[PDB]
Chain length 525, copies 3
């Protein structure tokens, strides 16, 4: 019954991330990884820091081995109104409450925005609640030893841009192979079930000859989903009802001015039929268009993409990917687990690429270390529920980036903002597992308030130009009960504007992203 041996099929980031984690955190396991000899930049979340910490990986050691750079924020260019306007979702555990009204809490920024519009445009919300914003905005970095950047923790509030394949190659050479992971070179061609009615793999077939025996098979074969989707036949739920993007093209561009260009951030540039990601690495920029075939041809999207990239557009080698934008109905089916794109994928607008991967890895390590590799159907059902809940949460969050945009300038954006219904279940009599659309609507229109329970939504709807109270006369009328006054907002305004001007001056004395990497991590170029 017990999982004693594991066969991982696939050797990308997902394969070696799984092999490394299992080899280090589950030493009781015998592990093999099957990789086909005969066969690109990505940004991470805060979540990634937990994975790195669990594997004892120091920035100094692994970052140079995969052209990694630092990431302090996701930047949204052209998303609100399609006129080059910018807003950040900076990394942070919690909103800095330092300049908040005692009585208005999180709603303080919105009242400032109503009273003093010229001083508090949408891009000021992030600055007003998160100082990581300043590092991102002026492309600077610091370990913040003396806490001179408020409520910023370098280790945990800074994530990474990585070459995922080289990251895998690092985990392979340094963690997996040394810990006795058996590297098997071969193509998985077929499988044998245990019996007509027992749908567990008895073994999988390598090169139409060799049978690989394992207690648990892990599918790290990406969009193919060879073991979970094909062999075990698990259905695929697409996200096409709230997310229109079903295609991606990707490319590598050389740096023109490497020091200036190697940004502290993943930029997301909204286009006519989707958005383009910008991922600075040590040696190059990784960039791609996520678009909707519903609204644009492959040829038209590529002409768009090249035009958008300028001179570096013309000779850029572009690779088209068919993206499984959705999830399998289950991650763990019989004696096979989907880890990475074999299970699920959200377009990386919230740098969610590796989420499907390290979440499932940590949840697998959790169950295997529970009772020496013994697991019940109840726990596997729990694994499926936990990781299903998560990808549904994140897919709704990503959908909100489109839903609240002001853009109606193309049929794509007219669909996203004016036609698509994001709350179809909301008029029914039953409470939804995924109810953030309903709850946000209640809090904003119903109660005229934000809440720290919006962890992330607040930065997105702020950047799209929404406020908890849309007009000041509304705020005024709520003070009238207990004969209160807003005059102290004049002091919050003056004091904060002063704090901003001096915070920018201090942040300009800090090393640039490139300088920090050169001096602290690389020691070179």
């Amino acid at each position: 019954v017990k999982i004693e041996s594991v066969a991982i099929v696939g050797g990308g980031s997902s394969g070696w991330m799984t092999a490394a984690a299992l080899s280090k955190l589950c030493p009781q396991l015998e592990i093999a990884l099957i990789e086909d000899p005969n066969i690109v930049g990505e940004s991470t979340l805060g979540h990634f820091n937990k994975f790195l910490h669990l594997l004892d990986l120091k920035d100094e050691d692994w970052m140079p081995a995969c052209n990694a750079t630092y990431k302090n924020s996701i930047r949204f260019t052209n998303f609100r109104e399609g006129k080059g306007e910018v807003f950040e979702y900076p990394f942070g555990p919690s909103l800095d409450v330092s300049f908040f009204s005692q009585t208005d809490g999180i709603n303080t920024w919105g009242k400032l925005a109503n009273k003093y519009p010229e001083d508090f445009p949408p891009e000021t919300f992030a600055r007003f609640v998160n100082s990581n914003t300043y590092l991102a905005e002026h492309n600077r970095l610091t370990r913040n030893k003396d806490n001179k950047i408020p409520n910023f923790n370098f280790d945990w509030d800074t994530a990474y841009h990585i070459d995922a394949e080289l990251f895998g190659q690092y985990l392979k050479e340094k963690i997996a192979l040394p810990n006795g992971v058996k590297h098997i070179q071969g193509k998985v061609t077929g499988y044998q079930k245990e019996s007509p009615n027992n749908h567990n793999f008895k073994y999988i077939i390598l090169d139409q000859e060799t049978a690989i025996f394992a207690d648990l098979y892990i599918d790290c074969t990406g969009f193919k989903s060879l073991l979970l989707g094909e062999f075990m036949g698990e259905a695929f739920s697409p996200f096409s009802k709230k997310l229109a993007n079903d295609k991606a093209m990707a490319t590598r561009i050389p740096y023109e001015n490497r020091e200036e260009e190697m940004h502290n951030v993943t930029d997301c540039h909204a286009m006519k039929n989707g958005w383009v990601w910008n991922i600075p690495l040590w040696n190059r920029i990784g960039t791609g268009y996520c678009y909707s075939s519903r609204f644009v041809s492959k040829d038209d999207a590529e002409a768009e993409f090249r035009e958008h990239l300028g001179e570096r557009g013309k000779d850029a080698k572009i690779f088209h990917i068919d993206i499984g934008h959705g999830k399998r109905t289950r991650a763990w089916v019989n004696n096979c687990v989907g880890i990475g794109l074999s299970y699920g994928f959200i377009e990386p607008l919230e740098s969610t690429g590796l989420l499907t991967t390290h979440e499932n890895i940590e949840n697998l390590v959790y169950l295997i270390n529970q009772r020496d590799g013994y697991v019940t159907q109840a726990e596997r059902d729990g694994f499926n529920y936990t990781c299903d809940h998560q990808i549904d949460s994140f897919s709704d969050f990503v959908a909100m980036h489109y839903a609240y945009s002001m853009r109606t300038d193309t049929p794509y954006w007219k669909w996203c903002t004016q036609m698509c219904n994001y709350m179809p279940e909301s008029m029914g009599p039953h409470r939804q597992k995924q109810s953030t659309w309903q709850d946000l609507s209640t809090d904003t229109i119903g109660l005229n308030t934000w809440h720290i329970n919006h962890n992330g939504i607040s930065f997105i709807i702020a950047g799209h130009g929404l406020r908890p109270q849309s007009y000041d006369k509304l705020s005024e009328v709520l003070l009238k009960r207990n004969n209160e006054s807003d005059y102290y907002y004049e002091d919050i305004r003056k004091d904060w504007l002063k704090h901003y001007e001096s915070m920018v001056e201090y942040v300009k004395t800090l090393p640039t992203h490139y300088e920090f990497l050169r001096d602290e991590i690389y020691g070179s170029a």
Copy 2:
């Protein structure tokens, strides 16, 4: 593309309340109101104070222009047992915790009721948690300068009896027209959609000739629901599964003793097949029967109503109204929004008449002021959810007034209390959006407790003669674990009974409702 111009169809309270609010709080809007030249008293909630404050309306200015009087409570005569018994739902932000046991909180009154029944009949719950109750009970009023009436704020804890048509006429002359609302006299006869697939109104037609162009059309046509219901074809969900009342008749009665009769309160008198509202105005009493055609004829209901009104019943002119007791499945459909009875209506047992109106107005003003009139489908879906949730909440609350009655003396009351199932979805496997029936049942029978989360339910089930713990031996047994004691209830009893006797004495030194109105608002 953004809402720059608005066409409101319908005058009345709803039409002019919408025109005034939009004209003042959304100055960027071009506004027109279409009213058909060829064509009553009602009570408000606390909610109404927010509306008045948003429009800067001072009591001195608007009250005399629409025969308005003050309202401190909803009074329920004849609802528990059908024997003239009375209980109040007084206005208040929160339950006054002053005489509550630290350990029993809200359940203090119930334990007093069990221990000292003669001293704590059902009508004492309201007195014990809200002092506004005393103003309502002795027909007195005060601005409470020095806070000598505990936890009462005159501005916000006092609502109003108004003539709704004259209130609209005030908003028209003083706010809407001055702020450039374009008054168009005409009958809306038809409409033209934008295209085969675009179901937005391209324009609406006036007198089968003139096309009115607007970015957004607001339906204030009342029960007709001409734009939302008829033209946009939005379905109607009736409340007939929990609320039986589908008819109203209404009348105007002259005062016999105006000073004595012009009450601080909306009285709701339960009858054989529904209930009669009493709304004191400056110059008259507004009164009507809400009834169920399922259980009584129009002529039987009218004979009932006239008998109930006494001598003034005989010559009273009575106007019969067909009430759309329910909601459209959506308020905002394409480029048309329902505001008022065009969207929804709950019989005014909880003075909820204007709720469907000022809630939707405030939620519309909120979205229009967000990004200069630009709104997403997500926000309109949010608007529909918010205002649907609210009318479902309030319709359940109103249903609870019937459900928990002791009355089984007519087939109507036998249906309300013994036959109607108010919790049909509750035995299924899924959690309901509307779960107050389920939650109250769990709190009372399951956990033997009330909660401040029952904001309002507590006054109603208290008045119907329910307690969180139905018998004292139950309370006794829960203290027995850690050898704890109730002896201090003797002191809560004596101290409170003293506080009541002296509170009535103070309240009797205050001006009467009529005196207050005469001296502070009118000057007759």
Copy 3:
């Protein structure tokens, strides 16, 4: 119109428990109990103490009248791994927080288990959070006058093993009959509804002759469910989707060494196709096999059971019962209420036998004392909701005892642990009324935490060898955010191990269960 008179059909524990409660707490009621002359041991919860306290019943008076003994814990032998391993669910109002990390709360024991495995095996969770555990473990009892056993209250944290029939006979003679409950000897043969459309009983028929008139009819007829199930036709929802056990056999075994054997606890011994209960009474041990006919024959289950009982297995008289393992879709239908097995039943793995009974009795007493016997449809619908919610909760809790076992040694245990899907609704878009499976899965795999909201689940999954954080490196990494340290766990370990060794020494000076009963009760 209001409940003035009540007819209880059935005279077991359920019948007389109902008659006694109503007669004492609802004096306004006229009460009759109909019992069939030709119709001829169980453990309780803490909740039973509330019932006893409501009826003013002192241990000294009622315990000897029904061969009652004391019960401080449910013990689970052979349930984790099928190798004689034991863990307790001891009685307690709350988890004792005395040795908990301020920052880790309930997760403290789990971190100790990871750091110091040899010192904190699964059986130590109960010891670490509940001292009642020590009384149960060393078969001792005390009134704890000086609170020398932390967070233990003798009156409320000690329940009972009772002969349920003799308990009913006591309530009959001492409370019900003296309070004027009218005892009617007869077989209920039929009924007449009020009209085509009014489905209320107008009366029920006794011996095909006599009509019994009552405002409210209470069905205490057990699995028969004559009034609720048969006459009112209320459907039965079985629990076979989560609980495989559909059969029970039961027996009486004499004591070999009564002093040593008369345990402080209900033992639940997991077998090949179910589990055997051990209920010590004053004069005998009551014992039975709950099993699944799906996985084992009646003859095979009985051979199993006799073998398990040893020498006194061979001559033991065994009584086979067909158990209605489920609930009626409603308890209160028209003017008839199901109380006891007529409404619902969970196999007594969580000593839940009397739950279906005293909870419905207390909920009925609650509504009747509200407005002098007047009740609305809303209140009756509320009664149905409350008592439906409860039996669904408890049936899920009982299912968790199987679901999380390590046993795969028979097809029965392979089914319970590796095949049965306990969370079928969980992948849907709607939130479930019953979502403890979903919420426990989220708390453990999702958030790597336990919660006091698991009141009881924690003892079961702890005993099955599960931890909130499964490995220590995971704990380490979560401290790293807010620069926190675990150093102080060395002191929690040493301090607690000291407290345990001295707690065992003190508990050994206390009287044994038998000594306590002999000196205090008999």
